[PDB]
Amino acid sequence: SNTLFDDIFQVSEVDPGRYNKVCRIEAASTTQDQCKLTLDINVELFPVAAQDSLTVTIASSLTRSWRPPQAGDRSLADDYDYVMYGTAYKFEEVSKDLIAVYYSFGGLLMRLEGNYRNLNNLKQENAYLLIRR
Amino acid sequence: ANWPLPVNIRRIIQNAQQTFHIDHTKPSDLTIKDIVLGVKDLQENLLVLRGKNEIIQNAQRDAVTLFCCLLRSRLATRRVLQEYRLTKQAFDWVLSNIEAQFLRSVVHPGEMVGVLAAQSIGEPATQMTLNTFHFAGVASKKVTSGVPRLKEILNVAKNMKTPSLTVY
Amino acid sequence: FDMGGYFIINGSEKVLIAQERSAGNIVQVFKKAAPSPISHVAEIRSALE
Amino acid sequence: TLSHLRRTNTPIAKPRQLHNTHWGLVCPAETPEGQACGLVKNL
Amino acid sequence: YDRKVPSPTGEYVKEPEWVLETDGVNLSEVMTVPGIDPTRIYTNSFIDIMEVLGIEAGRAALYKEVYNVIASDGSYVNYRHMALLVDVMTTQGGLTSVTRHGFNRSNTGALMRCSFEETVEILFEAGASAELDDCRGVSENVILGQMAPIGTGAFDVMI
Amino acid sequence: MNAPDRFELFLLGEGESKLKIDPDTKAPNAVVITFEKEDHTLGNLIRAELLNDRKVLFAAYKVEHPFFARFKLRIQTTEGYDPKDALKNACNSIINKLGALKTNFETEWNLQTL
Amino acid sequence: EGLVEYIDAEEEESILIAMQPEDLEPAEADVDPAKRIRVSHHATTFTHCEIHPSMILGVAASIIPFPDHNQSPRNTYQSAMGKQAMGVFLTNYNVRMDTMANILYYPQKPLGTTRAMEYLKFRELPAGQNAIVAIACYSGY
Amino acid sequence: EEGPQVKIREASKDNVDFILSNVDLAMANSLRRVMIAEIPTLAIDSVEVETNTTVLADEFIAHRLGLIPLQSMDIEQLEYSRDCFCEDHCDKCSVVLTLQAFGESESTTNVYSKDLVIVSNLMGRNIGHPIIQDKEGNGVLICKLRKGQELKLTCVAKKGIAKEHAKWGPAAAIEFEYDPWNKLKHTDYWYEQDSAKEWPQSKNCEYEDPPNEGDPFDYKAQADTFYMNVESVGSIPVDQVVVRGIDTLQKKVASILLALTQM
Amino acid sequence: RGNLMGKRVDFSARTVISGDPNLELDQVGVPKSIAKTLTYPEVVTPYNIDRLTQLVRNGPNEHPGAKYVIRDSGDRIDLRYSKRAGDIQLQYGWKVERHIMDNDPVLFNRQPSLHKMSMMAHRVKVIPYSTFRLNLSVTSPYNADFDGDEMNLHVPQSEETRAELSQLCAVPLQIVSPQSNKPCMGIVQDTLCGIRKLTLRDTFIELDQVLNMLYWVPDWDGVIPTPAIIKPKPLWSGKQILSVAIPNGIHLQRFDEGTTLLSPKDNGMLIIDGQIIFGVVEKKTVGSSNGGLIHVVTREKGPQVCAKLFGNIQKVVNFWLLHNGFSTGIGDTIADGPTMREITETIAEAKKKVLDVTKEAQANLLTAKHGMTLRESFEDNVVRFLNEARDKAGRLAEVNLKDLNNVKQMVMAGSKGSFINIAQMSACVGQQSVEGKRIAFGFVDRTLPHFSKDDYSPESKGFVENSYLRGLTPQEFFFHAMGGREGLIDTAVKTAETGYIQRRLVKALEDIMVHYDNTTRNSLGNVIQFIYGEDGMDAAHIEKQSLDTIGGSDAAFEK
Amino acid sequence: MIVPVRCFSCGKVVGDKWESYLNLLQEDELDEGTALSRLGLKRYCCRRMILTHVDLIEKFLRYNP
Amino acid sequence: EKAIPKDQRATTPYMTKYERARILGTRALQISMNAPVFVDLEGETDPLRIAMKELAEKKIPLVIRRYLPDGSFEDWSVEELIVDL
Amino acid sequence: ASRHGQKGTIGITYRREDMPFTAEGIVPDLIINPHAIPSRMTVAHLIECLLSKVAALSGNEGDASPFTDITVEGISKLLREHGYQSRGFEVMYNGHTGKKLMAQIFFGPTYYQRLRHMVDDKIHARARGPMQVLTRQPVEGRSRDGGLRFGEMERDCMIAHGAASFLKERLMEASDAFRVHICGICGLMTVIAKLN
RNA sequence: AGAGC
DNA sequence: CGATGCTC
Ligand SMILES: [Mg+2]
Ligand SMILES: [Zn+2]
Ligand SMILES: [Zn+2]
Ligand SMILES: [Zn+2]
């Protein structure tokens, strides 16, 4: 809107599978013992070590041709240190209650498992990923 | 299971899925009658030969046998609803798309098929490397292949180099 | 730097290309094909040097 | 020129093939590609 | 040999089997041997398949052989092309070769046959029996410098 | 034999004009300038300078074929800003920088021995 | 003085040849992994030894740098092309009145040579130039 | 002085080693290009052969004559013939040279660029004098003559730029390096074991601080410091190769600025 | 054969070919001199009169000009001579033999013409220099390279003749070929190599470069796509910018080895609405593959759009790569110290296995299986051991090649080379063969006079233990030369044999065509097939599809 | 066939350097590599120019006319 | 005679590519030879591009004589034939 | 061509400034494609280059003789001694931008040969000209301004395409075509041509 | 005849 | 009675 999903995740693994700028992160939420996250992060501009505590936010707004940031007086939903824009591609249900959402950030893949995704994560070319601390 | 057939059904489905903005959350507006009787009509409407007589009627029925086998396996009630999640709008469009694409797939009277067939075999034959096959390792695998064999076949060579029986 | 070995015929430089032939006065035996009534054949191509 | 002056021709079982006996006598490499291949040799 | 066989539960399952590979051919006699599967018996000698099993079985075995040559190279050619070639060799009731002995002897046009091989002699026997050339052939129209009944020339255009 | 004269790289042939301003059809406040008898020396330099301007939204150049000198420069500016003005400032900015460099080298050169 | 001898393919059949002088006949009792692998001795009843195994080659092949590091048909392809290469066929080119003559303005002796080139007078009458070459994907031209 | 900065490391009659700081890469490169291609010099563009009993061909000699470097100090006070209102060539647009050589001695006679004689009226400007950097003062061996050989020809030297023909190049090789520590990550080193061990260290590493092992990637950073070595053929002095390079580029940018006024 | 079936013709041209990354798929680069030679007879109509008069004024030496003006009498006016050459005032109904101009359809050809695709109509593009220039993706149907090859150009002389070329023979129409019911043209060489490199997860591009790449696509909508990254700096991924070349409404799904919708290895392929979701773009996607991006694009958007797709992909990739660079040196053949040690010993145990089987054979303990000689079974074993050795040593080498290894990079892209190449260059060349057997005893009981009699050892019978990097020994060299010679003889034989086969095939089927009753008949009207290919479908309009009822378990079918 | 005036790759004048090179080799008794470096031919493109030069003109001047 | 009437016509109601190519060619030849155009030109000058429009707007007055292998024929107008492709 | 069965034509020519460059200011005279290397397995080409580079740097002749103990490692050790990376790789900068190339280039000298048969010696074009006496068909040869062969194989491709009119045109309008008078009775070319 | 893919 | 296509 505003926000669509928010949580603080605990980093399980950090793997650079034959890459030097990218790492695939494995995580689970600190709150929900069922919620999981699998995400490719650009460790060159945002390094993530093992056992870290990162705030993952999924938004939908802060369309047409892209304009360079232009410091001027420009302000977006950024109070974070890592922002990404991508598209939703698969919404598979993993047993009765549990469901998973698939996002691609220009080929940087994201898989989020849980149940409370509900009236939020929809079939959109839109979706912004915001990570802080 | 994988065989060259006209009309890529999978691609038509994917096209309806994006065009009509399909959502795996809202129930479809289809009917068992809409699906079952729909695909049955699509079949009754696939043309290759347009004659209204028994011989041609049966000839036409035969040509579409394998394509209808594909059509039914891909457009069954369960799949249309559970897999594809199509609407009546997206379904009627898929049906009309197949029919048109099929008629486009048909060979045109005039096609010089003879030269086409000859060149289609003749060109890859030119690209064949070594008369000495990959079976040259073991002695009980030595059968004349490549250009020598292709020559034995085409000339209908009465006395072939490797005459063999394969007993099951 | 010229090496010679060639001729000059009507102003044109000619090379006599070395010609490969089977040597004469050699005895050589050969097996003959399946239909043939002669099993093997011994041959000499007797030439006067 | 040197090469032309050291050429061989074979008119007419397996003449085109590089034979073991060619060792130190005829060049294993230098032969024309196609038709003349194996019949035109170099010392 | 490896064989894809349907399992009692439906799925196709690899079931390896004993197969005999032979040097030499006598199909007629071998097929009657007890213990074999006369339904499955195969020969690379498509002529033998033709003589024993018929022209239709000959055709199948002929394509099987042409297919194998293309496939052994790793190449793929669509069925219809080889299908046509095989059918052509087959339509006359026997195995018609793709040489001057097979297709060039056929009931086709005198000018269309002399374009391949036996050029002069094909035209001589044509002038002996006093042959009437249809001119419905590609080669003859090519010789005559006329629009052949090929694609564009198959139909006529009128006002 | 079919070789064009080497002067055709840096010399305008009767009819050809240096700049050709074509208004872009795809985007608003966007223009396409065709530079005749010029290359990577001017194309890159101007394009890289236009990027330093905050009111410039888009700036890209291309040499469609090596055989010919002509390059294409696409400029998209913010509403109110004429892309032609952006090109002007980009050029003036370059000359000022070049002027400075000339003097700076001359000053350094005159301090040197050998 | 009978230190060297002439052998034909018929006599070749009755003799045992060593490939290298030293390396093929000294003694027996670590190595360089960069160097190629060799079969040692086993047969030690030599009657002759090869003057130099690079002498198995002739004129065109003798021009090739390291043919022993090349796929065999490339050595054959090169041999055919060397004859299409222009240089200085003779010093008297300005004096001969011949049908077609192609002379390189600045012939250059190759930086990479063969010991056999000394006898083929290649460094004295070359047929190419030592071009500074980049193996690269540049404009895709 | 304002924008870009210069710092000379080495300076001779033939070379200039300098650090070009506070510049954009696009500028440093456009400058490198213009020094190679767009500075006008004077070179022989026409050879009229009267006599050639030499071992070499007319056009072979003619080609070498164009490569001989000639004084191009006062090249701006000479017109491009294409702009000159004369019929063909004159003193406002060209310099005329004569080469007359005859092998008198039994021994081999050598023909040098020192032997070209200016016949044209130079009108007091420093132009067309064959550039001699040779210890013996001969400079460039045009050709060799036998017992009684002869070479008699006339050369018309004209204004031009390397873009038309490489003979008009005032510059030889321009050494050009930036970011000697690959801190910008502008290149990805090919290695077997260790890039650091396998790649030889650049001389310009002394002029920059090492990246320091325990530091994250500087993404925002851009190349602003360039290590260059402009080498002069001789036609124009080194300082001038650079100055005229800056000037030529300045002129073509001003040319475009003026073209906008014409519309 | 030489005068009726074929003959020498007018309005023909021939030269050396060259590749052009800046030419369109359906275009052909024509040297201005050739364009000036070859003419088209254009009738004077009010539609063209203005252009034609100007062309007549330009004359035979300026390019958009002409030579010859034919009047209502049939008399040609030679524009290069004639006093009235600069005087001519055109009349309607008169023909003007104008020079060949941009966008004229011409028939391009490369001999041998084994295909309908060896002759394709191209759009003229009059260019400087002496070679015919062509798009790199048109290379394969022609079976052309640029090592000295020459091609033929034919100019239609009639309005209906130029219609035939544009509506039937045109390059875009030939993309999906009826031969193998797949495309016959794809992304090759630099473009294929670069596209993999550009398309990696590590590959990120910055604004300045992005905008340049964006502008390179001519069709570009002018919309800057939002970067995949909006953290400390906007960073666009390689896949993102390449997706700009892909049209909208394009859907493609694949699945390779471990492809799992979360594609850990960046394998397989997923393209939605022409946006590449995941997977590295290589030969399977962008090549002349059966289910590829090319086959799909032609079927979905059409030939004219697909032809344009080649240009757009080429333009971005070639540009990105020009600024990235790609090379190959002796370093890419060098395998690690420890790797060589394994390779060396892998060959040592192979040499031992051979000695053991030899010793067994010699002891008369070795027993041959039914159908083969003790020696036939021995030779079979030794060769098996020796091939295993080369394959094992090669795999040992390939494994050691880093992702940065240029040869590996080319293999991975599918642009050039295979396993064998890596194996033979860096690990071991392997066993040599003549007549399918290892080096024969040319001399009495020996391969060479350097060996003793009755020596069956790998080394003795042509086993090249060394790699091309290490270098071959004189014995190895000569033996490899014997293998090579056999290859060349075979090449010369195969080229001739297949030529005669092709002519026979063509002559035997010339007259077979689909009649107006869907039947396949000859010149006599004799039926060959009642329905063409048994379905009456055109081969280019067909593709491999899964029949979902045939496979799976009984329970899985039911579910 | 005379030292090329200028190196093909870079353009550095090399035509004035042949006689000097020959005297460095003969008279000074120096080796090629040090001789080339003493002439100030630093880059390998300039080195291959002279080092690889075959002076066929001397053989050509031997012909009587 | 021989012929086939308008009713009982068993051939394809769709136009073949070969039919299209000949149709466009023959009409382009006519347009190129100053024959009248049955469509409103919109800056069009190319005889082929015009014929393509005359086909698009079904104003090509030509008939295809489809010969069957017995010799018999079927006359189909450009106006009635379906131009899908 | 190089000395390794590596034949190729000039695709384009670039001036010094558009060419990629060494930080020393060295630039190639030639640019060959990496793709010409893997399948051809012409490792000697690569070894020659490495050796020739060390040779040009040291002022000695490179011993590229066959059966010797000279190794790539041996060359490599000497090349690094000259201050270059042992495997012939060199950092290059893009001529157009000045920016360093992401990939390093295998750069060094290599002996190349200028081969006979050049474009200008091959370019042919004919739009009607001399006709042969007997056949009344175009002549055979560039020198004599001859017609290019539209052989029977070429004829086949046009049949396969279904271009009936182009085929008629190639065999008539271009090349041959002649008007003869035929008898309605005997059907022979015996009709006496008394025109006007 | 001789030569290039 | 066949015997790759092209070319000076
Ligand atoms: Mg080729
Ligand atoms: Zn003047
Ligand atoms: Zn140099
Ligand atoms: Zn009569």
Quickly list DSSP for I280-299.
Answer: ---HHHHSS-TTSHHHHHHH
Nearest to B138 among I380, I544, I550 (CB): I380
Give the experimental resolution in Å.
Answer: 3.1
Q: Which two tokens stand for residue G32?
A: 């360089």
User: Is the separation of the CB atoms in I558 and B9 below 8 Å?
Assistant: no
Rg over alpha carbons for chain K, rounded to the nearest Å, is 14
Nearest to K64 among E149, E151, E157 (CB): E157
- How far is it, in rounded angstroms, from Cα E109 to Cα E143? 12
Alpha helix (H) residue ranges in chain J: 18-25, 32-38, 44-51, 57-61
User: Is the separation of the CB atoms in E116 and E97 below 8 Å?
Assistant: no
User: Is the separation of the CB atoms in K38 and K78 below 8 Å?
Assistant: no
Q: Which two tokens stand for residue E110?
A: 């005198």
| F106 to H37: CB separation less than 8 angstroms, yes or no | no
User: Is the separation of the CB atoms in I45 and I55 below 8 Å?
Assistant: no
Q: Which two tokens stand for residue A45?
A: 């501009």
> From the CA of L185, which ligand is nearest?
4
User: Is the separation of the CB atoms in L108 and L49 below 8 Å?
Assistant: yes
CA A99 / C1′ M5 distance in Å: 61
Q: Which positions in strand N are less than 7 Å from the protein's CB atoms? A: 1-8
Three-state secondary structure of L136-159: CCECCCCCCCCCEEECHHHHHHHH
| H220 to I233: CB separation less than 8 angstroms, yes or no | yes
For residue I290, give its domain range. Answer: 189-323
Contacts 24+ apart (CB under 8 A), D9-12: D9/C17, D9/C18, D9/C19, D9/C20, D9/D39, D9/D40, D9/D41, D10/C20, D10/D38, D10/D39, D10/D40, D10/D41, D11/C19, D11/C20, D11/D39
CB-strand contact I145/M, under 7 Å: yes
Structural domain count of chain J: 1
H or E stretch covering I514: strand I513-514
Chains that touch C (3 or more CB pairs under 8 A): D, G
Return the bridge partners of A112, or none.
A37, A101
The beta strand positions in H29-93, using DSSP E, are: 41-52
CB-strand contact I147/M, under 7 Å: yes
User: Is the separation of the CB atoms in L163 and I168 below 8 Å?
Assistant: yes
Structural domains in chain F, CATH included, are 1-114 (3.30.1360.10)
* CATH, residue I289: 1.10.274.100
* CATH, residue J23: 1.10.10.60
Percent helix, strand, coil in chain K, to 5, is: 30, 15, 55
Nearest residue to nucleotide N2 when comparing alpha carbons to its C1'? E117
Structural domains in chain A, CATH included, are 1-133 (2.40.50.140)
Among candidate residues K66, K31, K33, the one with its CA nearest the CA of residue K50: K31
- How far is it, in rounded angstroms, from Cα L20 to Cα L93? 5
- How far is it, in rounded angstroms, from Cα L167 to Cα L173? 10
- How far is it, in rounded angstroms, from Cα B7 to Cα B105? 7
- D42 three-state secondary structure: strand
L and B touch with 3+ CB pairs <8 Å, answer: yes
Fill in the DSSP letter of residue L135. Answer: T
User: Is the separation of the CB atoms in B163 and E44 below 8 Å?
Assistant: yes
Chains that touch F (3 or more CB pairs under 8 A): A, H, I, L
Rg over alpha carbons for chain F, rounded to the nearest Å, is 18
In this structure, the number of other CB atoms found within 10 A of the CB of residue B59 comes to: 18
For residue H73, give its domain range. Answer: 41-166
- In the reported structure, the alpha carbon of residue L180 is separated from the centroid of ligand 4 by a whole-number distance in angstroms of 14
Final residue in a domain of this structure, among H166, H185, H216? H166
How far is D15 from chain C, CA to nearest CA, in Å?
10
- Alpha-carbon distances of B64 from B48, B93, D22, rounded to whole Å: 8, 21, 65
Phi, psi of L8 (to 5 degrees): -170, 150
In this structure, the number of other CB atoms found within 10 A of the CB of residue L131 comes to: 16
Q: What residue has token string 């391949």?
A: E116
Phi, psi of A70 (to 5 degrees): 55, 80
The beta strand positions in chain D, using DSSP E, are: 7-9, 40-42
User: Is the separation of the CB atoms in I9 and L174 below 8 Å?
Assistant: yes
Q: Which two tokens stand for residue B115?
A: 């030269």
Phi, psi of I455 (to 5 degrees): -105, 110
User: Is the separation of the CB atoms in L48 and L111 below 8 Å?
Assistant: yes
User: Is the separation of the CB atoms in I210 and I241 below 8 Å?
Assistant: yes
Alpha helix (H) residue ranges in A23-122: none
Q: Which two tokens stand for residue A110?
A: 């994201």
Nearest to L147 among I9, I157, I424 (CB): I9
Contacts 24+ apart (CB under 8 A), D23-27: D23/G12, D23/G56, D23/I448, D23/I449, D23/I478, D24/G50, D24/G55, D24/G56, D25/G9, D26/G58, D27/G56, D27/G57, D27/G58, D27/G59, D27/G60, D27/G61, D27/G79
Q: Which positions in strand M are less than 7 Å from the protein's CB atoms? A: 3-5
Q: Which amino acid is at G18?
A: A
Q: Hey, is the C-beta of E81 within 8 angstroms of any chain I C-beta?
A: yes
At a CB cut-off of 8 Å and minimum separation 6, what does L18 contact? F39, F40, F66, L95, L96
User: Is the separation of the CB atoms in I447 and I464 below 8 Å?
Assistant: no
In terms of C-beta density within 10 A (0-12 exposed, 13-18 middle, 19 or more buried), how is residue J29 classed? Answer: exposed
Fill in the DSSP letter of residue G84. Answer: G
| J63 to G94: CB separation less than 8 angstroms, yes or no | yes
At a CB cut-off of 8 Å and minimum separation 6, what does I346 contact? I389, I392, I393, I396
Q: Which two tokens stand for residue I316?
A: 């971005």
Q: What is the signed CA dihedral for F82, F83, F89, F91, rounded to 10 degrees?
A: -150
Nearest to I511 among E116, E138, E143 (CB): E138
Chains that touch I (3 or more CB pairs under 8 A): A, B, D, E, F, G, H, K, L
User: Is the separation of the CB atoms in L4 and L42 below 8 Å?
Assistant: yes
> From the CA of G77, which ligand is nearest?
1
Q: Is beta strand I132-134 parallel, antiparallel or unpaired with respect to I27-31? A: antiparallel
Q: Which two tokens stand for residue I399?
A: 């494994």
| F1 to L17: CB separation less than 8 angstroms, yes or no | no
Enumerate the residues of chain E whose CB falls inside 8 A of the CB of residue K23.
Answer: 157
- How far is it, in rounded angstroms, from Cα E3 to Cα J64? 87
Task: Name the CATH superfamily, with its identifier, for domain L131-196.
Answer: RNA polymerase alpha subunit dimerisation domain (3.90.1800.10)
Return the bridge partners of C41, or none.
C30
Residues H152 and H194 grouped into a single domain: no
Phi, psi of I340 (to 5 degrees): -60, -40
Q: What residue has token string 């400034």?
A: L17
Query: Which residues of chain F approach chain A closer than 8 Å at the C-beta?
Result: 27, 54, 57
- Sign of the CA dihedral running I349, I353, I354, I358: positive
H or E stretch covering G12: helix G9-12
Among candidate residues I21, I12, I26, I35, the one with its CA nearest the CA of residue I129: I35
DSSP string, I405-463: -HHHHHHHHTSS--HHHHIIIII--EE-EETTEE---SBTTBSSTTSPSS--STTTTTE
Q: Which amino acid is at H238?
A: V
Q: Is beta strand I132-134 parallel, antiparallel or unpaired with respect to H5-11? A: unpaired
- L111 three-state secondary structure: strand
- Asked if the bond preceding K2 is cis, omega within 30° of 0, the reply is yes
In terms of C-beta density within 10 A (0-12 exposed, 13-18 middle, 19 or more buried), how is residue I364 classed? Answer: exposed
CB-strand contact I111/N, under 7 Å: yes
- How far is it, in rounded angstroms, from Cα I7 to Cα E143? 11
E and F touch with 3+ CB pairs <8 Å, answer: no
Residues H70 and H153 grouped into a single domain: yes
CA H151 / C1′ N4 distance in Å: 56
Nearest residue to nucleotide N1 when comparing alpha carbons to its C1'? E118
User: Is the separation of the CB atoms in B26 and B86 below 8 Å?
Assistant: no
For residue J60, give its domain range. Answer: 1-65
The beta strand positions in chain A, using DSSP E, are: 3-15, 23-29, 36-41, 53-59, 82-85, 87-93, 99-104, 109-114, 128-132
- In the reported structure, the alpha carbon of residue H95 is separated from the centroid of ligand 2 by a whole-number distance in angstroms of 10
Structural domains in chain K, CATH included, are 1-85 (3.90.940.10)
